[PDB]
Amino acid sequence: GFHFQQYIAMAGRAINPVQWTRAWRRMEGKSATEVYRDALAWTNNQFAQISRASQYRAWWWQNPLGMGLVLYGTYKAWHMIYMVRKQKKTAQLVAAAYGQGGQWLNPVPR
Amino acid sequence: GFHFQQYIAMAGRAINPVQWTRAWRRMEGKSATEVYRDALAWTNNQFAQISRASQYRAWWWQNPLGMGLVLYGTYKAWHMIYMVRKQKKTAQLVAAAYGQGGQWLNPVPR
Amino acid sequence: MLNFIPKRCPSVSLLFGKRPVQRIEVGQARHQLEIPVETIEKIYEGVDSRLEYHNKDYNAMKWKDFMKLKLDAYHLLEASQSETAAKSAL
Amino acid sequence: MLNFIPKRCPSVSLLFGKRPVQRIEVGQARHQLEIPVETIEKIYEGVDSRLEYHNKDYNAMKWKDFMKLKLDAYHLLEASQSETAAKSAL
Amino acid sequence: GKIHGAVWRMKHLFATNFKMVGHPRYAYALPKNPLLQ
Amino acid sequence: YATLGSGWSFSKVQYTKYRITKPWTTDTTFDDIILSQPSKEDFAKFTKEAPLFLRFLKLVTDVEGRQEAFIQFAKRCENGLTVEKDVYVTKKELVDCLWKNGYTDTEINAFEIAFPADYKFHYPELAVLFDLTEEDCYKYCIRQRAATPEELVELKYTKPKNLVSSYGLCFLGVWFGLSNTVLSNAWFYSKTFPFGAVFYMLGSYFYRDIREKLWKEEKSLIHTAQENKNMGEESVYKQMKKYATDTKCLDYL
Amino acid sequence: YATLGSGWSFSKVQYTKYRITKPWTTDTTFDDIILSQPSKEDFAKFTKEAPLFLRFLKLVTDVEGRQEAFIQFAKRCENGLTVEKDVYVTKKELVDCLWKNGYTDTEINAFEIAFPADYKFHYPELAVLFDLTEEDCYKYCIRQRAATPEELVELKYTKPKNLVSSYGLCFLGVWFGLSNTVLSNAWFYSKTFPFGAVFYMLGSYFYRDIREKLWKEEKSLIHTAQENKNMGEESVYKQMKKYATDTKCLDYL
Amino acid sequence: KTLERNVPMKEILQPLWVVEPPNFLRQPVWKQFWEAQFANRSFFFFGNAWTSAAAFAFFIWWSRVFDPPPKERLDRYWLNSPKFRILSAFHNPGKRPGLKISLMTYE
Numbered sequence A, B: 001g002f003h004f005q006q007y008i009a010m011a012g013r014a015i016n017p018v019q020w021t022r023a024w025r026r027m028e029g030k031s032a033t034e035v036y037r038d039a040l041a042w043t044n045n046q047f048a049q050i051s052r053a054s055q056y057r058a059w060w061w062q063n064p065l066g067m068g069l070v071l072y073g074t075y076k077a078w079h080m081i082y083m084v085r086k087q088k089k090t091a092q093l094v095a096a097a098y099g100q101g102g103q104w105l106n107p108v109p110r
Numbered sequence C, D: 001m002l003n004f005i006p007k008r009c010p011s012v013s014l015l016f017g018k019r020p021v022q023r024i025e026v027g028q029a030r031h032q033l034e035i036p037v038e039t040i041e042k043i044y045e046g047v048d049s050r051l052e053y054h055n056k057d058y059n060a061m062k063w064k065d066f067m068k069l070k071l072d073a074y075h076l077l078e079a080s081q082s083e084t085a086a087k088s089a090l
Numbered sequence E: 001g002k003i004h005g006a007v008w009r010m011k012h013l014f015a016t017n018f019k020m021v022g023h024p025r026y027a028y029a030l031p032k033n034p035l036l037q
Numbered sequence F, G: 001y002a003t004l005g006s007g008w009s010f011s012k013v014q015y016t017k018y019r020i021t022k023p024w025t026t027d028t029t030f031d032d033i034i035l036s037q038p039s040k041e042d043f044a045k046f047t048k049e050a051p052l053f054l055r056f057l058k059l060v061t062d063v064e065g066r067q068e069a070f071i072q073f074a075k076r077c078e079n080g081l082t083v084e085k086d087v088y089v090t091k092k093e094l095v096d097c098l099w100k101n102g103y104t105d106t107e108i109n110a111f112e113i114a115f116p117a118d119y120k121f122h123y124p125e126l127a128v129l130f131d132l133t134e135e136d137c138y139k140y141c142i143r144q145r146a147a148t149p150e151e152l153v154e155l156k157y158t159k160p161k162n163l164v165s166s167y168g169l170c171f172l173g174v175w176f177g178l179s180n181t182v183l184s185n186a187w188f189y190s191k192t193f194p195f196g197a198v199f200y201m202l203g204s205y206f207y208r209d210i211r212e213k214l215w216k217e218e219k220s221l222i223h224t225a226q227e228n229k230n231m232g233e234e235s236v237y238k239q240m241k242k243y244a245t246d247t248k249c250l251d252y253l
Numbered sequence H: 001k002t003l004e005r006n007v008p009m010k011e012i013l014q015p016l017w018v019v020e021p022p023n024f025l026r027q028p029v030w031k032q033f034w035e036a037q038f039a040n041r042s043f044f045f046f047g048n049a050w051t052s053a054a055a056f057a058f059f060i061w062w063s064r065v066f067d068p069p070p071k072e073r074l075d076r077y078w079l080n081s082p083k084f085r086i087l088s089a090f091h092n093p094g095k096r097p098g099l100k101i102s103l104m105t106y107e
C-alpha cells in the first residue's frame, strides 16, 4: 500500500464541483473505452509500483506483518465507516417498523 | 520519545514476581541514595538520548509536529487508561450512593 | 541463453555501432572476447520488432534463427565434453 | 578562544607526545603553523583536573593563566590593527 | 498457482543450461552433430 | 515495473525503525523515482563546473574533427552548466559501456586519467561527447538510475494539495467510523486483538526464520542457474579457441 | 549526550517517508550507537584481510626496533583478523591526527601510498602500530564513530524479550482504554480533531517557513562566531610572524 | 541541439501488467474446460479439478433446490425471514408491514 494521502486528495477533488465542469470539458472527444483503459492503467501502475518497490524499499509503516497490516487496516476502516453506518440505519429502521430484534422473531404460533 | 516497547517490557518484568526475589537479592548492601541516583540517571540518559539524536535522526513516527504528537499520544493513552477508568468507578459509586448526577444536586430548599 | 536481443537504439544501448568491434566477458574467470560488429548485426536481420520485453528494451528473434544458434552452441558444448570430437570443423 | 584543553590521554588525543612537534591550521586560508610540544605542555601545568567538560575530554585551565594567554592574544591583535605599533617586541 | 510455480522453476533450471535445447526424450529428432565422429 | 540491472546478486534488505534523512533544503525534496514517476521539469536543477570536462571535450573534438560543437557547448556552458541534478551516469558505467562497445584502450585510459573516480556525467555532456541526442542520453541516464533505485532522487518541492477537502473527508470518516462500539466489542477483545497480537508476536520472534525458510529455494535456483551459465559459456569458449586455427588451411593451400 | 565533532557546518536534516534499509543478515542488526549504548560483546564481529596491513607493519617495526610485536601479531592474525566490525578509524582521520601531532611528511606519504583511500583501521591495528593499548584504541574509535552517528552500527541480533507480559499489558491497556465514549465524544469532534487537524495542516503547509524563521538567528550567530575566530587567528599569526625575527639579536651580539 | 521538451517517465519506464493474471497456457478458460472433459477423471463434475467444481456449481444451479419457493410454500420459511422483513420495512419507509405480512400469509 501507498499514497493514501493522494487518494484522499483525489476524493476531495472529485467531490469538488468545479472539477465536475473541468471533467465535463475534458470529456470532449473521448470514448468510454479510453476512460476505462486509463482507469485500469492507473490501478495497474499503483499495483506495479508496489510489486517493484517492495523488493528494496520500506515504508514508515513497515512491520513484521508487512503490507498485510495496512490492507487489514484499510478493510477495517471501510467496515467501520460504511458497513457499521448501514447497520445503524438498518437497526433504527427495524426498531421503528417491528421493534428491536423484530427481524429475528419466531413465526406466529399455530 | 523512544523505546516504548522497552518500557512495556520493563513494566512486565517489574510485575513478574520472580523479579521481586531477584531485586530483593540485588538490594543486599545498597542505599536509598544509590537507588534514587540510579533512577534519576536512567531518566536523564533517556532525555539526553532524545536531545542528542533528534538533531540528526528521525524515527518511524516522525511527522510535521515532531515529538509533540508522540507526547500528546502518551498523555491521551494515560488519560483513557487511568483517569477515565477512575471516572467510571466514581460514576458507579455516585449512582449507587445518591443517584446519577447526585454530586451536582442543588442544596435542599429552605 | 534467452531470446532477448538488446535494442541498438542509443536510448537503450548507448554507443552500439560507434566502433567496429564488440567485447564481452565470458565465464567465472571473465575471459575477454572480441566480436565483429557485422557478425553481431547479422542477428538484427532475424530480430522481430513486434515483440519487446523487459521495459521494451529487448526484442525477440525468430525461433528458427534462435534455435539454430542454440544448436550450434549445444554442438560445440557436447563436442567439448566428448573426447572423440573432430580436431577441426572442416 | 575557550578554556577547553584536550586531555592528552591516548583514549582522547591519540599520539599527543609521540613526536616532539604539534601542527595547526590557522584562519580561513588554513595557514600551517608548527609549535614545540614543550611550549604546549607548559599549559598542562596550569590545567585543572577537577574540571572536565564535553564528554569529559577537555579540562579547564586556571583563570589566571587563561586570561594571561587571552591578554597576550589581544595585545598582538590590537598591535596588528594599529599602525604605530612597535617594530619589535624587545 | 501450481502452473506458475512450475514455470518459475523451469525458467531457472532450463533457460541457462546450453544442454537443454529441448527435452531429452525428444533428442532423436535433433539434427546430427558435424563435430562428432 | 521491471527489475533492471545486470547483477546476479540475490539481495534482500532488513529495515530499521529510523527514516532516511537528507540535508535541509528549502526548495527540494528527495523521493523514489519509481514511486514519483517524475518528469524533466519535476527534477531539480543545479550548476556544474565545466573546465575539467571542457578540456577533455576540446581534445575529443580536435581528434574527431568537429569544433563547432565544442564552441557552441562552451558558449552555452560558461558560468557553469545548468542541468537536472539526479540525471547522470557514473564513470564506471560509462567505462563498461565503452569497453563492451569497442572503444580503444587508449581512449579508455584517457577517460580514466582525465576524470576522477566519483565523477558524474550528465546527458548534455554525453550528447556533446558522443554526437548523440540529449533526449536519448536523458532516457539512458534515467534507465541507469532506475537500475539503482535505492538511491533517492531530488525533485522540486511542492506544497501539499487539497488539504481542505481532505480534512472534510477525514472528519466524515471519523464521524462515521468511531460512532460505534467496534473497538469495545467482545468480538474485538476475543478475536481481533488476540489473533492479531499473536500473529504480530510470532512474526516479530520468527521474522528471520520465516524469511530464510522461504528464500532457501530461490537462492538455490539462482545459484544453479548461475553455475550452469558459467560452465556452458566456458566450455563453448574453450572449444571455439580449439577450433580457432582452422582458417589458415586456405592461405596455406 | 555531547555533540562531538570538529566541524563548524550548521547542518539540519529533512526526513522522508521511507525507512533506512540494509542488506539482509540472519545474525546482525543495524542500530544507532547512542540509542543502543552497545558493548564490545554486543558489537558484531568479522574477519579482515591482513597482508596489506602486515607489510606496512613489518616496515614500521623494522624501523622502530620491535619485531617481537610483529611476529606475535602476525601469528595471532593469520587466517584473518577477527575483530568488531563497526569499531574503526578512517584513513583521513588518522592522517589528520598524525599531521597535527607531528609525524613527518615521509611517514604520512608512506601511509597514503600504502593504504587505499577507503581503508578502515581497527583498534588492534592501531595498538600494534603505535605501541598503545587496545582499550585506549577502542575508546578512541568509539568516540570517532559517535562523532559521526548518522551512520548505523552493526550489532548482534537478539530475539525480542518479554512478549507474553507485553501482550498481557497491552490487552489490559485496550480493555481499559477503549471501553469508553472518548473517541465518539462531542468534545472529540469539536476540539480534539479540529484543533489537531488544523495544527497538522498548518505544520505540513508551513513546515519549512517555520524552521527557517527559527534557525535564522542561530545561523547568524554561528557565522559571526566563525568570522571572529578566523580574523583573530589571522591577525595574531601575522603579528607573531612580524615579531619572529627578534631572537637573532642575541647571536648577532 | 538542446533539450526543451518535458519528457514524461512513461516514455522511458514501462510498468508491467499485473492487474489481470498471466495465462501461461495461452488458451481461454472455456477451451481449458472443454479439454478437461476428455482427460481421465475430469469429466464434468467427477474428479477434484477446478472444472469439476465449476460443473458441480452449474449443476446445482441448473437444479431446482436453489430456486425460489412457490406461493403455496412461501409461508413455510420466507414470510418469517429476516431478509423479507428488512426488505419490506425498507421499501415501506415510514410504515409497519406486520399487518400486510399477516394478510400475505392468509393469502
Ligand SMILES: CCCCCCCCCCCCCCCCCC(=O)OC[C@H](COP(=O)([O-])OCC(O)COP(=O)([O-])OC[C@@H](COC(=O)CCCCCCCCCCCCCCCCC)OC(=O)CCCCCCCCCCCCCCCCC)OC(=O)CCCCCCCCCCCCCCCCC
Residues within 6 Å of the ligand: A060, A061, A062, A063, A064, A069, A070, A073, A076, B002, B003, B004, B005, B006, B008, B060, B061, B070, B071, B073, B074, B076, B077, B080, F015, F016, F017, F183, F192, F193, F195, F196, F197, F200, F201, G163, G166, G167, G170, G174, G177, G178
Ligand atoms: C487500537 C489502536 C487504538 C488504541 C487505543 C486508543 C488510544 C488513542 C491514543 C493513541 C496514542 C498512541 C500512543 C503514542 C505513543 C507512541 C507509541 C509508539 O509509537 O510506539 C508504539 C510501539 C512501538 O514501539 P517503538 O518504541 O516505536 O519500537 C518499535 C520496534 O522497534 C519495532 O520496530 P518495527 O520497525 O518492526 O515496527 C515499528 C512499529 C510500526 O508501527 C506502525 O507503523 C503501524 C504499522 C501499520 C500501519 C497502519 C497502522 C494502523 C492500522 C494497522 C494497525 C492497527 C492497530 C493500530 C495501531 C496504532 C498505532 C499505529 O511497530 C508497531 O508499533 C506495531 C504496532 C502494530 C501492532 C499490531 C497489533 C495487532 C493487534 C490488534 C489487532 C489488529 C488491530 C485491531 C483494530 C484496531 C483499530 C484501532 O508499538 C507497540 O505497540 C509495541 C508492541 C510490542 C509487542 C507487544 C505484544 C503484541 C501486542 C500488539 C499490540 C501492541 C499495542 C498496540 C495497541 C494497538 C493495537 C490494538
Ligand SMILES: CCCCCCCCCCCCCCCCCC(=O)OC[C@H](COP(=O)([O-])OCC(O)COP(=O)([O-])OC[C@@H](COC(=O)CCCCCCCCCCCCCCCCC)OC(=O)CCCCCCCCCCCCCCCCC)OC(=O)CCCCCCCCCCCCCCCCC
Residues within 6 Å of the ligand: A001, A002, A003, A004, A005, A006, A008, A060, A061, A070, A071, A072, A073, A074, A076, A077, A080, B060, B061, B062, B063, B064, B069, B070, B073, B076, F163, F166, F167, F170, F174, F177, F178, G016, G017, G183, G192, G193, G196, G197, G200, G201
Ligand atoms: C483516530 C485513530 C482511529 C481511527 C478510527 C479507527 C479505525 C481503526 C482502523 C485503523 C486502520 C488504519 C488505516 C490503515 C491503512 C493505511 C493508512 C496509512 O498508513 O496512511 C494514512 C495517511 C498517511 O498517508 P501516506 O500515504 O502514508 O503518506 C504520508 C505522507 O507522505 C506524509 O508523510 P510524513 O512522513 O510527513 O508522515 C507520515 C505519517 C505519519 O504517521 C505516523 O507515523 C503517526 C505519527 C505519530 C505516532 C503515534 C501515532 C498514534 C498517536 C498520535 C496520532 C493520533 C492519531 C491516530 C493516528 C493513527 C494512525 C497512526 O503521516 C500521518 O499518517 C499523519 C497521521 C497523524 C495525523 C494526526 C491528525 C490529528 C487529528 C486528530 C486529533 C489527534 C488524535 C485524537 C486522538 C485519536 C486517538 C485514536 O495518514 C493520513 O491520515 C493522511 C492525512 C492527510 C491530511 C488530511 C487532513 C488532516 C486530517 C488529519 C487526520 C487524517 C486522518 C487520520 C485519522 C486519525 C486521526 C483522527
Ligand SMILES: CCCCCCCCCCCCCCCCCC(=O)OC[C@H](COP(=O)([O-])OCC(O)COP(=O)([O-])OC[C@@H](COC(=O)CCCCCCCCCCCCCCCCC)OC(=O)CCCCCCCCCCCCCCCCC)OC(=O)CCCCCCCCCCCCCCCCC
Residues within 6 Å of the ligand: A012, A013, A015, A016, A017, A018, A019, A020, A021, F161, F162, F163, F164, F165, F166
Ligand atoms: C436532491 C436534493 C439535494 C439537492 C441539494 C444538493 C446540495 C449540494 C450543495 C452543494 C455542495 C456540494 C458538495 C461539495 C462542497 C464543496 C466542497 C469543496 O469543494 O471544498 C474544497 C475547497 C477546495 O479547496 P482544496 O480542496 O483544499 O484545494 C483545492 C483548491 O482550493 C483549488 O480548488 P478549485 O480550483 O478546483 O476551485 C476553487 C473554488 C472552490 O470553492 C468551492 O468550495 C466550490 C464551491 C462551489 C459550490 C457550488 C454548488 C453548486 C450546486 C448548488 C447550486 C447553487 C447555485 C449556484 C450555482 C453556481 C454558480 C454561482 O473557489 C475558490 O476556492 C476561490 C476562488 C473562487 C473562484 C470561482 C469559484 C466559483 C466557480 C463558478 C461556479 C461553478 C459552478 C459549477 C457548476 C456546478 C453544476 C452542478 O475548499 C473548501 O473547502 C471551501 C470551503 C468549503 C465550503 C463550505 C464553507 C463553509 C460553509 C458551510 C455551509 C454552512 C453549513 C451548512 C448549513 C447550511 C444551512 C442552509
Ligand SMILES: CCCCCCCCCCCCCCCCCC(=O)OC[C@H](COP(=O)([O-])OCC(O)COP(=O)([O-])OC[C@@H](COC(=O)CCCCCCCCCCCCCCCCC)OC(=O)CCCCCCCCCCCCCCCCC)OC(=O)CCCCCCCCCCCCCCCCC
Residues within 6 Å of the ligand: B012, B013, B015, B016, B017, B018, B019, B020, B021, G161, G162, G163, G164, G165, G166
Ligand atoms: C490481598 C488479596 C489479594 C491476594 C491475591 C493476590 C493474587 C496474585 C496472583 C499471583 C500472580 C501475580 C501477578 C503476576 C502474574 C505473572 C505474570 C508473568 O510473569 O507472566 C510473564 C511470564 C514471563 O514470560 P515473558 O515476560 O514473556 O519473558 C520472560 C521470560 O519468561 C523469563 O521469565 P523469568 O526468568 O523471570 O521466570 C520464568 C518463570 C515465569 O513463570 C511465571 O509466570 C511466574 C509465575 C509465578 C507466580 C507466583 C505467584 C506467587 C503469589 C501467589 C502465591 C502462590 C503460592 C506459590 C508460591 C510460589 C512457590 C511455588 O517460569 C517460567 O517461565 C518457566 C520456568 C519455571 C522456573 C521456576 C519458576 C518458579 C520459581 C519459584 C517460585 C518463585 C516464587 C517467588 C516468590 C514470590 C513471593 C511474593 O510469561 C507468562 O505470561 C506465563 C503465563 C502467565 C501466567 C498465567 C497462565 C494462564 C493461567 C491464568 C490463570 C487462570 C485465569 C484466572 C482464573 C483463576 C481462578 C482461580
Ligand SMILES: CCCCCCCC/C=C/CCCCCCCC(=O)OC[C@H](COP(=O)(O)OCCN)OC(=O)CCCCCCC/C=C/CCCCCCCC
Residues within 6 Å of the ligand: H037, H044, H059, H061, H062, H063, H064, H067
Ligand atoms: C453429454 C455430453 C456433454 C457432456 C458435457 C461436455 C460439455 C458440453 C458443453 C456444452 C455447453 C452448454 C452450455 C449451457 C449454457 C447454459 C445456459 C443456461 O443456463 O440457460 C438456462 C437453461 C436451463 O434453464 P432451467 O432448466 O430453467 O434451469 C433453471 C435453474 N433453476 O440451460 C440449459 O438448459 C442447460 C441444459 C444442460 C444442463 C446440464 C445437464 C446436467 C445433467 C446431469 C446428468 C444427468 C444424468 C441423468 C441420467 C439419467 C439416468 C437414468
Ligand SMILES: CCCCCCCC/C=C/CCCCCCCC(=O)OC[C@H](COP(=O)(O)OCCN)OC(=O)CCCCCCC/C=C/CCCCCCCC
Residues within 6 Å of the ligand: H059, H060, H062, H063, H064, H065
Ligand atoms: C463436509 C461434508 C459435506 C458433504 C456435502 C456434499 C453433498 C453432496 C451431495 C449432492 C450431490 C448428490 C447427487 C444428487 C443426484 C440425485 C439424482 C439425480 O440425478 O437427480 C438430478 C437432480 C436434478 O433434478 P431437477 O431438479 O429436477 O432438474 C431440473 C432442471 N431444471 O439433481 C439435483 O437435484 C441437485 C442436487 C443438489 C444437491 C444439494 C446441493 C448441496 C450444496 C453442496 C455445495 C456446498 C459445498 C458442499 C461441500 C463439498 C463436499 C465435497
